[PDB]
UniProtKB/Swiss-Prot annotation:
Its EC number is 1.14.99.66. Acetylated by KAT8 in epithelial but not in mesenchymal cells, thereby regulating the epithelial-to-mesenchymal transition. Acetylation by KAT8 reduces KDM1A association with nucleosomes, thereby decreasing histone H3 demethylation, leading to transcription activatio of target genes. This is Lysine-specific histone demethylase 1A. The chain holds residues 172 to 832 of 852 of the full protein. Its cofactor is FAD. GO terms for molecular function: chromatin binding; DNA-binding transcription factor binding; enzyme binding; FAD-dependent H3K4me/H3K4me3 demethylase activity; flavin adenine dinucleotide binding; histone demethylase activity; histone H3K4 demethylase activity; histone H3K9 demethylase activity. Ubiquitously expressed. FAD binds at S118, E137, R139, R145, M161, V162, E620, T629, V630. GO terms for cellular component: chromatin; chromosome, telomeric region; DNA repair complex; histone methyltransferase complex; nucleoplasm; nucleus; protein-containing complex; transcription regulator complex.
Amino acid sequence: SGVEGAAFQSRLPHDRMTSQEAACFPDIISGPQQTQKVFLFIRNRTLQLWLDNPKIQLTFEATLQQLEAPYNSDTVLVHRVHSYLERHGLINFGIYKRIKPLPTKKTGKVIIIGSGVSGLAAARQLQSFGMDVTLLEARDRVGGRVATFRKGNYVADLGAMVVTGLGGNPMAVVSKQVNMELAKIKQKCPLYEANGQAVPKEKDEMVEQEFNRLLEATSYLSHQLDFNVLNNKPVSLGQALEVVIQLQEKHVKDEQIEHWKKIVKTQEELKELLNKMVNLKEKIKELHQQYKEASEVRDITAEFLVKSKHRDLTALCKEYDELAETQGKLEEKLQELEANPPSDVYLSSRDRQILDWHFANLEFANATPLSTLSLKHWDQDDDFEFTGSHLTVRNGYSCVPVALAEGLDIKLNTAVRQVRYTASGCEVIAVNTRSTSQTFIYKCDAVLCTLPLGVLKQQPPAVQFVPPLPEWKTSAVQRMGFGNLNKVVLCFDRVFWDPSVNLFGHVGSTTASRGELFLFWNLYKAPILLALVAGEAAGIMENISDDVIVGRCLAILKGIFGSSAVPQPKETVVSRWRADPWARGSYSYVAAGSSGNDYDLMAQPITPGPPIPRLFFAGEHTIRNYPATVHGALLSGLREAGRIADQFLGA
Ligand SMILES: Cc1cc2nc3c(=O)[nH]c(=O)nc-3n(C[C@H](O)[C@H](O)[C@H](O)COP(=O)(O)OP(=O)(O)OC[C@H]3O[C@@H](n4cnc5c(N)ncnc54)[C@H](O)[C@@H]3O)c2cc1C
Ligand SMILES: O=CCCc1ccc(-c2cc(F)ccc2C(F)(F)F)cc1
């Protein structure tokens, strides 16, 4: 609906106050119900005004003038609701034209570490709020793990490239603000085996159905039967899958055994039956010799003898023909059995390879081998997935952080090395990545750390904290997963693939290598193919040079399309996200032995000892309900900007 749709697009229930709103409006939530409904209407209506035109700042004044009677009479409540929505980044976020220009007097100094989407989104908010913000970025570009290759007409993303559903997604708004072209991903994903032969549609569907069954069985084991600890070790999804596959093979073999037993028993009965017929034919042969001697010789005792032999001899053929139809009733039962054997195997060798492709796909979506994922919590965020098809960014995802950086004070080539925070202020120490001799010392009242989890995990530490971070924070950093995923960009001068197909799979020959170049993406205006390296393959392939890995790509493509069809690429690009010192991997995952609560602990600010919080955290690894995505990075920056403004400017 209308105001209903605005709540939904803001990830809020249209008919209930959230717990956060109850915190900020206790007089409302404890007061009469009719005022609760007035509150919800004003909140939903204000969200609608913003979402229907997110290119323009929505002021309190303009909200008041577009509210209908009688809501435009409660000026104070409107202001309370508008101020709340703005402070937390539900309206007036991203890039939009200001109506009310910024104050020249800044209040409070914030240093933001890192200039990815979470740092940029927080910076824009803090600046909007009238604070003095500087971002320090170690790279020579903004965007972090949004990273687009651009040369001539060639565009290709080496970082994020997928926008998940638009329903509920804040990137829907940013996409409008930036005029980013999104294209829905077409569903057809043909698979080719290592010999290049396409997988028949029926077998692709059979195997995909098994994959879904296996996953559901792991989820039942985990949540209904509490199979989550394995000899005092947290069980991984990988471990669980392989056990469920093991039981399926065990069940196939048992049904084979029960079938071979039915065969053997039927064969035994057929054997004894023939034996019984042998003895009965020998009995008729013997008796028929006595019909011949009796017929040979006629008085009444001899004639009677013929009638008695003839009567018994027909009776013995009556016995024999009885056994004959029991013989047929068996033989047809035997024939039927050895014509309809149950499954010989659970998964043929080729079937298991195709199944391993779907596991590779799952290792792509989590950026890690399945043996590292928490069985219980790997999909702990699935209640928050957006509705709609997934899309890709046709003109390159870097358009978003480039536009978010407009008007911000950003120091590139500036690597933070130490972060000192005391009950009286903060100092950030950074070195210039071009003259390591050159050192800078930025004073500020608060630090917003958007360092990637991979950087926080680094040992020896890349960034030193003074005082060191609390044990409860370092432990969460150690527990949480940080994955890896890489891409090969192949730029050609002609299209030799199916232009109507966005995706196609290469089925690898072994389990261990299932993530090697398993998925190819056709996304761009120029003749460009992207190949993914996922799972165990991702980290290992970083040690292979660009040339050898491109060769392996071309071998795969020549296997699908033909030697003569695949030219040499004009240009190639190969990501190495784990080796990248400013990322150390691609995105977080819920590791066995972690949980969603570690994402909440990562977001918790640090307060210096004997006081107010000085050190704050954002980034994809700090947002429990939306981890490992661009929108999660964004929402985490909006959240921290609100928390920081509440602290230093007042709610
Ligand atoms: C290969 C790949 C594929 C992905 N695919 C999916 C997808 O398609 N869609 C999706 O939504 N998400 C995807 N993601 C994840 C998504 O890109 C990230 O979750 C998000 O971009 C992370 O943003 P962030 O602000 O948390 O961190 P980052 O973007 O990493 O920003 C942190 C910043 O800190 C900087 N920095 C590091 N060390 C220092 C230092 N010492 N001093 C100063 N600055 C420093 C970094 O250079 C960086 O700019 C993908 C990521 C990768 C790498
Ligand atoms: O190119 C890099 C892939 C980055 C990425 C990570 C996670 C998702 C994601 C996030 C969700 F909440 C639900 C489903 C998915 C997906 F299935 F796509 F993986 C999308 C893109």
